[PDB]
Amino acid sequence: PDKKLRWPLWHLFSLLDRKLITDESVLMDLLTRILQVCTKTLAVLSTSSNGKENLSKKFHLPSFDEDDLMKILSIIMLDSCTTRVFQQTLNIIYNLSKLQGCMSIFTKHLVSLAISIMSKLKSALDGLSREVGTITTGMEINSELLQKFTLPSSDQAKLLKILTTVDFLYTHKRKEEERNVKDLQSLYDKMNGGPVWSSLSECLSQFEKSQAINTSATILLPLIESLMVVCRRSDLSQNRNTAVKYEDAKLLDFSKTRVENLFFPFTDAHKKLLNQMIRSNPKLMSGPFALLVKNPKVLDFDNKRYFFNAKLKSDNQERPKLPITVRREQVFLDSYRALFFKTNDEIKNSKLEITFKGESGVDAGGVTREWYQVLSRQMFNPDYALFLPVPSDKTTFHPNRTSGINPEHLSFFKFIGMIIGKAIRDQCFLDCHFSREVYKNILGRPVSLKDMESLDPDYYKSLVWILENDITDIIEETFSVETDDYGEHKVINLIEGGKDIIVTEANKQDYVKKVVEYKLQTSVKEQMDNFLVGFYALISKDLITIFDEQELELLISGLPDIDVDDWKNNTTYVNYTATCKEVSYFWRAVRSFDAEERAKLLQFVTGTSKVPLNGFKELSGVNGVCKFSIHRDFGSSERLPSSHTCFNQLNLPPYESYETLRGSLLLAINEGHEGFGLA
């Protein structure tokens, strides 16, 4: 019969495979529009007719063969689909899927297409990535090689559409939890893949080592989208955990690496090029690269601040007012009582209508710029015990467990809690410092262990011997941490049986981490949380996670500056000649090193900012004066260096030459958490 006369529908399908047609949008668009209706009901009808099925015997609901299914999606790889044809071909395929006996055919055809297509790429990609950095700077590239990447009738767009539709089939509607992400991995795995991904790394790192008039590293934009589509749902979370050692070599073997260990190992060897694409087209964070947000480590500081700015709240309508008449001698309390509840939600929408006592409008408006600075200077208010100047050093302020004495400290925290956000709400650089532990209370992170050594040797010395050498249950040291409560020093049971349970070789980490947590978390932290409550109220926790505990300081205090000569001369060497000749090349590269690169380094050995003045010979820490002295320590000679801001101990395991020490120091400064922190 051929079904041509026994079913009207097949007539239309017979159109699809006619060269005379399918070279136009309207014809394809209109035919797809028509098919959108029958298939919509066709899927509904049979699926909706279980017991009262008296309609299939009337219309003869067709049966779908091999060529009944392949024909619908044979055009998704055609040279005519626009961004209207696809948006309906996808819906056609989805609606048709619900009919029995199709999903297997769909998947088999899709993987066949994938294997068919991902073989011309490598035959061509090798051609391109072998050209970059092979002629000169100032020359051009034979368009024919680029002619295969530029036209919308390329191959990449197909390699993106195919994966898009696979996801949509296994994504659209249904339940994400009900999904079966596991098998999704296999389908791409069944695809040959591999070489294409691995052969791409030799093209996305071939622009950082050359220059060209064409340059334009955006040509390989399509793929990179797909390479993120593959990882879009795999885990992209908790797989980043690595570090341990500094590799100091690329290699980039990407044969298979399954499809869940392809995300984080990739995107690291290529960080310079990736970063220098957002700063040229900042709109590339709401689409193609939208996923990178879940990899904070891979985004430098500058792009992060901008991406934070535009998204922040650019939807308001000016600020009505803020009639506050502080006399400039009370400030803090006058505002704590005058701002009462100035539309907390829209409290941001209030300009500072403040004059010192009788002054006028000069040097433009917003002269309160200094008002905040003096506020910060007056925020500490040494008379009040709301904080402590970090007994370890006056340069910073401390949670000050004795902050509960102040009768009305509660409302005060919210004021400064939201006021600090106001400076963040604007572009200000008020000076403030609270040391790493205080910052970590904001960003979701547990307390650190090594901080005790430098933050407060007192209790670390109580455990300095313990955790090594003498940690053999020789001492008892019943569990639970010493408790100060302005009275009876009753050691409060950390665990349910802290007093009864001893800190044996088994109860090591729990007791140690909770004792450390008690100092930094069981303190006025609850009262200081009031400072966070307003800050959290003003800005959501998710809105700040893009940064880390280390860079929140730089957000608060303007990017600090630093010279070279003072740090070059005001130095000290212990069993060392200031270097092995390796720090020397880094000593020169410090000028090459970015201010952020330099600035972060100071935080590693001090963690306070606030350039000490006097030429770095003024190193007032715990002893009032210090001089950071490099130490050899006869460590592993390849392990990452270390230091202690208590006295700027500093360290340098003997390295060899360029690359090794350079990147080791780079990682150390970028290490932040999991190094001198939690670890």
mmCIF file of C-alpha atoms in Angstrom, residues 306-648:
data_model
loop_
_atom_site.group_PDB
_atom_site.id
_atom_site.type_symbol
_atom_site.label_atom_id
_atom_site.label_comp_id
_atom_site.label_asym_id
_atom_site.label_seq_id
_atom_site.Cartn_x
_atom_site.Cartn_y
_atom_site.Cartn_z
ATOM 1 C CA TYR A 306 32.192 44.447 37.834
ATOM 2 C CA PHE A 307 29.946 41.395 37.592
ATOM 3 C CA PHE A 308 28.962 42.194 41.174
ATOM 4 C CA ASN A 309 28.238 45.843 40.348
ATOM 5 C CA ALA A 310 25.894 45.644 37.361
ATOM 6 C CA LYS A 311 23.829 42.792 38.797
ATOM 7 C CA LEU A 312 23.702 44.323 42.268
ATOM 8 C CA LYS A 313 20.550 46.466 42.258
ATOM 9 C CA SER A 314 20.561 48.539 39.068
ATOM 10 C CA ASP A 315 16.754 48.766 39.048
ATOM 11 C CA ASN A 316 15.989 51.537 41.573
ATOM 12 C CA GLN A 317 14.665 55.093 41.115
ATOM 13 C CA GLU A 318 17.021 57.546 42.836
ATOM 14 C CA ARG A 319 16.935 58.015 46.631
ATOM 15 C CA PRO A 320 14.234 60.209 48.247
ATOM 16 C CA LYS A 321 16.162 61.619 51.218
ATOM 17 C CA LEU A 322 17.675 61.180 54.691
ATOM 18 C CA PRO A 323 17.171 64.257 56.911
ATOM 19 C CA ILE A 324 19.847 63.538 59.526
ATOM 20 C CA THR A 325 21.388 66.500 61.337
ATOM 21 C CA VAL A 326 24.365 64.987 63.159
ATOM 22 C CA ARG A 327 26.492 67.668 64.809
ATOM 23 C CA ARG A 328 29.769 65.855 63.904
ATOM 24 C CA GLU A 329 30.681 65.382 67.599
ATOM 25 C CA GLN A 330 28.136 62.637 68.394
ATOM 26 C CA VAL A 331 27.601 60.942 65.009
ATOM 27 C CA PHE A 332 27.473 57.279 66.056
ATOM 28 C CA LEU A 333 24.766 57.456 68.729
ATOM 29 C CA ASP A 334 22.880 60.302 67.053
ATOM 30 C CA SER A 335 22.430 58.166 63.937
ATOM 31 C CA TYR A 336 21.755 55.023 65.978
ATOM 32 C CA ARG A 337 18.783 56.958 67.380
ATOM 33 C CA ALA A 338 17.883 59.070 64.326
ATOM 34 C CA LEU A 339 17.719 56.502 61.507
ATOM 35 C CA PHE A 340 15.257 54.463 63.636
ATOM 36 C CA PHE A 341 13.707 52.330 60.858
ATOM 37 C CA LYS A 342 14.298 54.277 57.633
ATOM 38 C CA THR A 343 12.474 51.817 55.362
ATOM 39 C CA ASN A 344 15.058 49.068 55.981
ATOM 40 C CA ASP A 345 14.146 47.487 52.640
ATOM 41 C CA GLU A 346 14.612 50.814 50.825
ATOM 42 C CA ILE A 347 16.865 52.356 53.496
ATOM 43 C CA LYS A 348 19.458 52.290 50.720
ATOM 44 C CA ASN A 349 17.276 54.931 49.032
ATOM 45 C CA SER A 350 18.336 57.774 51.313
ATOM 46 C CA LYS A 351 20.912 60.465 50.556
ATOM 47 C CA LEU A 352 22.898 61.777 53.520
ATOM 48 C CA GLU A 353 21.338 65.182 54.227
ATOM 49 C CA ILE A 354 24.016 65.800 56.843
ATOM 50 C CA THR A 355 26.086 68.886 57.653
ATOM 51 C CA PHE A 356 28.849 68.985 60.250
ATOM 52 C CA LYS A 357 27.312 71.750 62.350
ATOM 53 C CA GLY A 358 26.482 74.679 60.057
ATOM 54 C CA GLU A 359 28.510 74.125 56.904
ATOM 55 C CA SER A 360 27.323 74.419 53.306
ATOM 56 C CA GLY A 361 27.565 72.628 49.960
ATOM 57 C CA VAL A 362 31.156 72.773 48.708
ATOM 58 C CA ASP A 363 33.427 70.283 46.948
ATOM 59 C CA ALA A 364 30.271 68.795 45.413
ATOM 60 C CA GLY A 365 27.678 66.842 47.378
ATOM 61 C CA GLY A 366 28.233 63.614 49.229
ATOM 62 C CA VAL A 367 31.001 65.113 51.367
ATOM 63 C CA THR A 368 29.968 62.476 53.915
ATOM 64 C CA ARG A 369 32.595 60.397 52.083
ATOM 65 C CA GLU A 370 34.798 61.580 54.940
ATOM 66 C CA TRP A 371 31.895 61.178 57.381
ATOM 67 C CA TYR A 372 32.082 57.425 56.809
ATOM 68 C CA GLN A 373 35.872 57.426 57.182
ATOM 69 C CA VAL A 374 35.727 59.348 60.450
ATOM 70 C CA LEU A 375 32.782 57.119 61.356
ATOM 71 C CA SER A 376 35.058 54.118 60.819
ATOM 72 C CA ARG A 377 37.699 55.911 62.871
ATOM 73 C CA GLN A 378 34.952 56.671 65.402
ATOM 74 C CA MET A 379 33.267 53.298 64.823
ATOM 75 C CA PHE A 380 35.896 51.568 66.954
ATOM 76 C CA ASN A 381 35.304 54.095 69.764
ATOM 77 C CA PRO A 382 37.954 52.678 72.134
ATOM 78 C CA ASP A 383 35.835 53.989 75.014
ATOM 79 C CA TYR A 384 33.195 51.396 74.150
ATOM 80 C CA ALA A 385 34.187 47.737 74.484
ATOM 81 C CA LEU A 386 32.304 46.606 71.367
ATOM 82 C CA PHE A 387 35.612 45.323 69.948
ATOM 83 C CA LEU A 388 39.266 44.822 70.896
ATOM 84 C CA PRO A 389 42.349 45.955 68.925
ATOM 85 C CA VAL A 390 43.552 42.378 68.342
ATOM 86 C CA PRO A 391 45.865 42.078 71.392
ATOM 87 C CA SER A 392 48.234 40.298 69.011
ATOM 88 C CA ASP A 393 48.552 43.695 67.304
ATOM 89 C CA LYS A 394 46.739 47.029 67.485
ATOM 90 C CA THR A 395 46.642 47.211 63.674
ATOM 91 C CA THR A 396 43.429 45.137 63.636
ATOM 92 C CA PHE A 397 40.238 44.820 65.676
ATOM 93 C CA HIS A 398 38.952 41.691 67.389
ATOM 94 C CA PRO A 399 35.556 40.123 68.223
ATOM 95 C CA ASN A 400 36.250 41.048 71.849
ATOM 96 C CA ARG A 401 34.341 38.439 73.874
ATOM 97 C CA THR A 402 33.970 41.240 76.467
ATOM 98 C CA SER A 403 31.619 43.051 74.058
ATOM 99 C CA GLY A 404 28.502 41.839 75.885
ATOM 100 C CA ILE A 405 28.995 44.304 78.736
ATOM 101 C CA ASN A 406 27.731 47.247 76.680
ATOM 102 C CA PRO A 407 24.045 47.644 77.642
ATOM 103 C CA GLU A 408 22.796 48.520 74.134
ATOM 104 C CA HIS A 409 25.322 46.806 71.867
ATOM 105 C CA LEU A 410 22.442 44.980 70.148
ATOM 106 C CA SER A 411 21.027 47.793 68.015
ATOM 107 C CA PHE A 412 24.546 49.140 67.482
ATOM 108 C CA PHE A 413 25.608 46.062 65.507
ATOM 109 C CA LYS A 414 22.757 46.451 63.016
ATOM 110 C CA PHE A 415 23.628 50.109 62.409
ATOM 111 C CA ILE A 416 27.268 49.388 61.592
ATOM 112 C CA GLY A 417 26.027 46.098 60.152
ATOM 113 C CA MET A 418 23.971 47.882 57.510
ATOM 114 C CA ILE A 419 26.114 51.033 57.386
ATOM 115 C CA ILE A 420 29.108 49.025 56.178
ATOM 116 C CA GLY A 421 26.790 47.677 53.500
ATOM 117 C CA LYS A 422 25.977 51.253 52.514
ATOM 118 C CA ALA A 423 29.629 51.815 51.642
ATOM 119 C CA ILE A 424 29.420 48.526 49.752
ATOM 120 C CA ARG A 425 26.104 49.807 48.399
ATOM 121 C CA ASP A 426 28.221 52.635 46.943
ATOM 122 C CA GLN A 427 31.831 52.883 45.741
ATOM 123 C CA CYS A 428 33.753 53.696 48.929
ATOM 124 C CA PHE A 429 36.998 52.478 50.489
ATOM 125 C CA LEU A 430 36.522 53.079 54.208
ATOM 126 C CA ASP A 431 39.383 51.656 56.266
ATOM 127 C CA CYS A 432 38.564 48.721 58.543
ATOM 128 C CA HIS A 433 40.234 45.457 59.511
ATOM 129 C CA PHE A 434 39.045 42.404 61.433
ATOM 130 C CA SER A 435 41.598 39.657 60.628
ATOM 131 C CA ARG A 436 40.864 36.477 58.679
ATOM 132 C CA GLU A 437 38.782 34.657 61.295
ATOM 133 C CA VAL A 438 36.221 37.462 61.540
ATOM 134 C CA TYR A 439 35.847 37.521 57.757
ATOM 135 C CA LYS A 440 35.368 33.749 57.629
ATOM 136 C CA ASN A 441 32.303 34.091 59.865
ATOM 137 C CA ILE A 442 30.591 35.828 56.939
ATOM 138 C CA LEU A 443 31.485 33.519 54.055
ATOM 139 C CA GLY A 444 30.270 29.982 54.629
ATOM 140 C CA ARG A 445 33.420 28.290 55.921
ATOM 141 C CA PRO A 446 34.455 26.464 59.112
ATOM 142 C CA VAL A 447 37.103 27.840 61.431
ATOM 143 C CA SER A 448 40.803 27.314 60.738
ATOM 144 C CA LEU A 449 43.287 25.385 62.867
ATOM 145 C CA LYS A 450 46.642 26.937 61.936
ATOM 146 C CA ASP A 451 45.303 30.422 62.726
ATOM 147 C CA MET A 452 45.708 29.708 66.447
ATOM 148 C CA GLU A 453 49.495 29.545 66.103
ATOM 149 C CA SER A 454 49.663 33.082 64.714
ATOM 150 C CA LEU A 455 46.350 34.547 65.899
ATOM 151 C CA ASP A 456 46.927 33.481 69.508
ATOM 152 C CA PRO A 457 49.921 31.315 70.504
ATOM 153 C CA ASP A 458 48.558 31.241 74.076
ATOM 154 C CA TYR A 459 46.057 28.440 73.441
ATOM 155 C CA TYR A 460 47.941 27.023 70.452
ATOM 156 C CA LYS A 461 50.949 26.621 72.740
ATOM 157 C CA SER A 462 48.563 24.751 75.036
ATOM 158 C CA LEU A 463 48.107 22.388 72.063
ATOM 159 C CA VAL A 464 51.358 23.142 70.211
ATOM 160 C CA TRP A 465 53.004 20.113 71.808
ATOM 161 C CA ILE A 466 49.799 18.116 71.357
ATOM 162 C CA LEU A 467 48.828 16.824 67.880
ATOM 163 C CA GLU A 468 52.444 15.611 67.536
ATOM 164 C CA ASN A 469 55.354 14.234 69.538
ATOM 165 C CA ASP A 470 53.416 13.796 72.796
ATOM 166 C CA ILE A 471 49.998 12.897 71.305
ATOM 167 C CA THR A 472 49.940 9.289 72.501
ATOM 168 C CA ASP A 473 47.154 9.454 75.119
ATOM 169 C CA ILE A 474 49.956 10.148 77.618
ATOM 170 C CA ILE A 475 47.975 13.198 78.739
ATOM 171 C CA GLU A 476 44.253 13.059 79.516
ATOM 172 C CA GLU A 477 42.959 16.613 78.943
ATOM 173 C CA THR A 478 39.281 15.752 79.327
ATOM 174 C CA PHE A 479 37.211 16.897 76.356
ATOM 175 C CA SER A 480 35.245 20.166 76.219
ATOM 176 C CA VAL A 481 36.836 23.623 75.999
ATOM 177 C CA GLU A 482 37.552 26.097 78.775
ATOM 178 C CA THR A 483 34.625 28.498 79.154
ATOM 179 C CA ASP A 484 34.710 32.139 80.261
ATOM 180 C CA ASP A 485 31.382 33.546 81.459
ATOM 181 C CA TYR A 486 32.330 36.568 83.602
ATOM 182 C CA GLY A 487 32.173 34.329 86.665
ATOM 183 C CA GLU A 488 32.446 30.610 87.375
ATOM 184 C CA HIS A 489 34.888 29.208 84.806
ATOM 185 C CA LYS A 490 32.788 26.089 84.250
ATOM 186 C CA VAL A 491 34.185 24.149 81.296
ATOM 187 C CA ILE A 492 31.092 23.796 79.121
ATOM 188 C CA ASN A 493 30.535 20.342 77.636
ATOM 189 C CA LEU A 494 31.344 20.733 73.942
ATOM 190 C CA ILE A 495 30.049 17.274 73.042
ATOM 191 C CA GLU A 496 27.304 15.758 75.193
ATOM 192 C CA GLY A 497 29.987 14.046 77.278
ATOM 193 C CA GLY A 498 32.833 16.509 76.837
ATOM 194 C CA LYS A 499 33.819 16.382 80.501
ATOM 195 C CA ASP A 500 33.392 12.609 80.769
ATOM 196 C CA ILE A 501 34.834 11.832 77.330
ATOM 197 C CA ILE A 502 38.602 12.257 77.226
ATOM 198 C CA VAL A 503 40.520 13.648 74.241
ATOM 199 C CA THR A 504 42.092 10.329 73.301
ATOM 200 C CA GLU A 505 43.815 9.386 70.045
ATOM 201 C CA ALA A 506 40.287 8.837 68.683
ATOM 202 C CA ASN A 507 38.644 12.072 69.885
ATOM 203 C CA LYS A 508 41.364 14.267 68.385
ATOM 204 C CA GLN A 509 39.822 16.193 65.498
ATOM 205 C CA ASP A 510 36.367 16.652 67.022
ATOM 206 C CA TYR A 511 37.714 18.128 70.254
ATOM 207 C CA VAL A 512 40.398 20.239 68.569
ATOM 208 C CA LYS A 513 38.108 21.681 65.899
ATOM 209 C CA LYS A 514 35.351 22.422 68.413
ATOM 210 C CA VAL A 515 37.790 24.050 70.849
ATOM 211 C CA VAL A 516 39.021 26.242 68.003
ATOM 212 C CA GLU A 517 35.415 26.853 66.948
ATOM 213 C CA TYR A 518 34.441 27.802 70.501
ATOM 214 C CA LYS A 519 36.895 30.706 70.600
ATOM 215 C CA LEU A 520 35.800 32.077 67.221
ATOM 216 C CA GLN A 521 32.159 30.935 67.096
ATOM 217 C CA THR A 522 30.786 30.547 70.645
ATOM 218 C CA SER A 523 31.939 34.086 71.521
ATOM 219 C CA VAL A 524 29.981 37.324 70.985
ATOM 220 C CA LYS A 525 29.829 35.891 67.449
ATOM 221 C CA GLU A 526 26.140 35.498 68.283
ATOM 222 C CA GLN A 527 26.035 39.185 69.196
ATOM 223 C CA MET A 528 28.275 40.044 66.248
ATOM 224 C CA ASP A 529 25.926 37.991 64.072
ATOM 225 C CA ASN A 530 23.596 40.934 64.659
ATOM 226 C CA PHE A 531 26.194 42.784 62.598
ATOM 227 C CA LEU A 532 25.759 40.059 59.979
ATOM 228 C CA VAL A 533 21.966 39.948 60.360
ATOM 229 C CA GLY A 534 21.641 43.465 58.986
ATOM 230 C CA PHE A 535 24.377 42.813 56.442
ATOM 231 C CA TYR A 536 22.643 39.569 55.495
ATOM 232 C CA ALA A 537 19.369 41.502 55.487
ATOM 233 C CA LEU A 538 20.900 44.190 53.273
ATOM 234 C CA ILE A 539 22.591 41.621 51.000
ATOM 235 C CA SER A 540 21.814 37.919 50.686
ATOM 236 C CA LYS A 541 24.425 35.312 51.562
ATOM 237 C CA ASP A 542 24.352 33.974 48.001
ATOM 238 C CA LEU A 543 25.107 37.478 46.707
ATOM 239 C CA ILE A 544 28.509 37.486 48.468
ATOM 240 C CA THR A 545 29.702 33.911 47.872
ATOM 241 C CA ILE A 546 31.402 34.946 44.619
ATOM 242 C CA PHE A 547 34.269 36.349 46.693
ATOM 243 C CA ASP A 548 36.070 34.432 49.454
ATOM 244 C CA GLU A 549 36.997 35.137 53.064
ATOM 245 C CA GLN A 550 40.315 36.588 51.896
ATOM 246 C CA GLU A 551 39.011 39.122 49.364
ATOM 247 C CA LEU A 552 36.188 40.466 51.536
ATOM 248 C CA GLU A 553 38.904 42.542 53.204
ATOM 249 C CA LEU A 554 39.905 44.050 49.860
ATOM 250 C CA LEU A 555 36.231 44.750 49.203
ATOM 251 C CA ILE A 556 36.025 46.594 52.525
ATOM 252 C CA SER A 557 39.345 48.456 52.388
ATOM 253 C CA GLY A 558 40.458 50.056 49.142
ATOM 254 C CA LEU A 559 43.024 48.014 47.231
ATOM 255 C CA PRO A 560 46.108 48.727 49.369
ATOM 256 C CA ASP A 561 49.290 49.941 47.716
ATOM 257 C CA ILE A 562 52.856 48.859 48.423
ATOM 258 C CA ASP A 563 56.341 49.912 47.349
ATOM 259 C CA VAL A 564 59.389 47.731 46.604
ATOM 260 C CA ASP A 565 62.473 49.351 48.141
ATOM 261 C CA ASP A 566 61.133 49.274 51.700
ATOM 262 C CA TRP A 567 60.340 45.569 51.418
ATOM 263 C CA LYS A 568 63.629 45.068 49.559
ATOM 264 C CA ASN A 569 65.849 46.552 52.289
ATOM 265 C CA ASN A 570 63.922 46.235 55.565
ATOM 266 C CA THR A 571 64.387 42.454 55.529
ATOM 267 C CA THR A 572 66.094 39.722 57.541
ATOM 268 C CA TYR A 573 67.626 36.360 56.652
ATOM 269 C CA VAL A 574 67.905 33.291 58.892
ATOM 270 C CA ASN A 575 70.469 30.715 57.737
ATOM 271 C CA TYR A 576 69.910 32.246 54.299
ATOM 272 C CA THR A 577 71.278 34.846 51.885
ATOM 273 C CA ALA A 578 67.772 36.239 51.197
ATOM 274 C CA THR A 579 67.228 33.648 48.427
ATOM 275 C CA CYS A 580 68.581 30.684 46.496
ATOM 276 C CA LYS A 581 68.777 33.060 43.476
ATOM 277 C CA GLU A 582 65.178 31.978 42.710
ATOM 278 C CA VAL A 583 63.410 34.515 44.947
ATOM 279 C CA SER A 584 65.685 36.938 43.096
ATOM 280 C CA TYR A 585 63.824 36.562 39.803
ATOM 281 C CA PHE A 586 60.599 36.792 41.794
ATOM 282 C CA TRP A 587 62.112 39.798 43.570
ATOM 283 C CA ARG A 588 62.253 41.457 40.148
ATOM 284 C CA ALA A 589 58.894 40.040 39.014
ATOM 285 C CA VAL A 590 57.175 41.671 42.002
ATOM 286 C CA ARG A 591 56.960 44.739 39.779
ATOM 287 C CA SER A 592 55.580 42.406 37.111
ATOM 288 C CA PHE A 593 53.260 40.885 39.712
ATOM 289 C CA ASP A 594 49.856 42.547 39.786
ATOM 290 C CA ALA A 595 49.029 44.835 42.693
ATOM 291 C CA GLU A 596 46.492 42.191 43.675
ATOM 292 C CA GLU A 597 49.256 39.629 43.185
ATOM 293 C CA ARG A 598 51.493 41.737 45.426
ATOM 294 C CA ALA A 599 48.721 42.736 47.826
ATOM 295 C CA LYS A 600 47.573 39.174 48.483
ATOM 296 C CA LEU A 601 51.166 38.244 49.341
ATOM 297 C CA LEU A 602 51.234 40.696 52.250
ATOM 298 C CA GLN A 603 48.003 39.230 53.617
ATOM 299 C CA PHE A 604 49.681 35.815 53.717
ATOM 300 C CA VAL A 605 52.377 36.932 56.169
ATOM 301 C CA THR A 606 50.347 39.638 57.961
ATOM 302 C CA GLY A 607 46.670 39.169 57.116
ATOM 303 C CA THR A 608 45.949 42.766 58.127
ATOM 304 C CA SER A 609 46.689 45.186 55.246
ATOM 305 C CA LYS A 610 47.149 48.731 56.644
ATOM 306 C CA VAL A 611 50.578 49.464 55.164
ATOM 307 C CA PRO A 612 52.668 49.914 58.329
ATOM 308 C CA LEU A 613 54.336 53.202 57.328
ATOM 309 C CA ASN A 614 57.956 53.995 58.319
ATOM 310 C CA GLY A 615 59.227 51.828 55.444
ATOM 311 C CA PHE A 616 58.282 48.352 56.729
ATOM 312 C CA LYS A 617 60.893 48.661 59.462
ATOM 313 C CA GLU A 618 57.878 49.540 61.616
ATOM 314 C CA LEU A 619 56.497 46.024 62.054
ATOM 315 C CA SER A 620 54.460 46.449 65.239
ATOM 316 C CA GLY A 621 52.905 43.043 65.840
ATOM 317 C CA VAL A 622 52.768 41.477 69.302
ATOM 318 C CA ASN A 623 56.183 42.740 70.425
ATOM 319 C CA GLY A 624 55.740 46.317 69.170
ATOM 320 C CA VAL A 625 58.529 45.908 66.596
ATOM 321 C CA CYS A 626 59.478 43.050 64.286
ATOM 322 C CA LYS A 627 61.369 42.205 61.105
ATOM 323 C CA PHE A 628 60.106 39.399 58.873
ATOM 324 C CA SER A 629 63.015 36.960 58.617
ATOM 325 C CA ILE A 630 63.019 34.299 55.918
ATOM 326 C CA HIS A 631 63.616 30.769 57.203
ATOM 327 C CA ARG A 632 64.736 27.577 55.480
ATOM 328 C CA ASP A 633 63.359 25.134 58.077
ATOM 329 C CA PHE A 634 64.910 22.177 56.208
ATOM 330 C CA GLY A 635 61.499 20.972 55.096
ATOM 331 C CA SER A 636 60.694 18.809 52.078
ATOM 332 C CA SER A 637 62.250 21.215 49.499
ATOM 333 C CA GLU A 638 59.126 20.709 47.329
ATOM 334 C CA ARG A 639 56.292 21.251 49.828
ATOM 335 C CA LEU A 640 54.504 24.581 49.691
ATOM 336 C CA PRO A 641 56.036 27.360 51.825
ATOM 337 C CA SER A 642 54.535 28.679 55.060
ATOM 338 C CA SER A 643 54.696 31.548 57.530
ATOM 339 C CA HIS A 644 53.222 32.865 60.775
ATOM 340 C CA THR A 645 51.986 36.439 61.134
ATOM 341 C CA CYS A 646 52.540 36.267 64.905
ATOM 342 C CA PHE A 647 56.118 37.314 64.140
ATOM 343 C CA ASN A 648 56.226 37.014 60.320
#
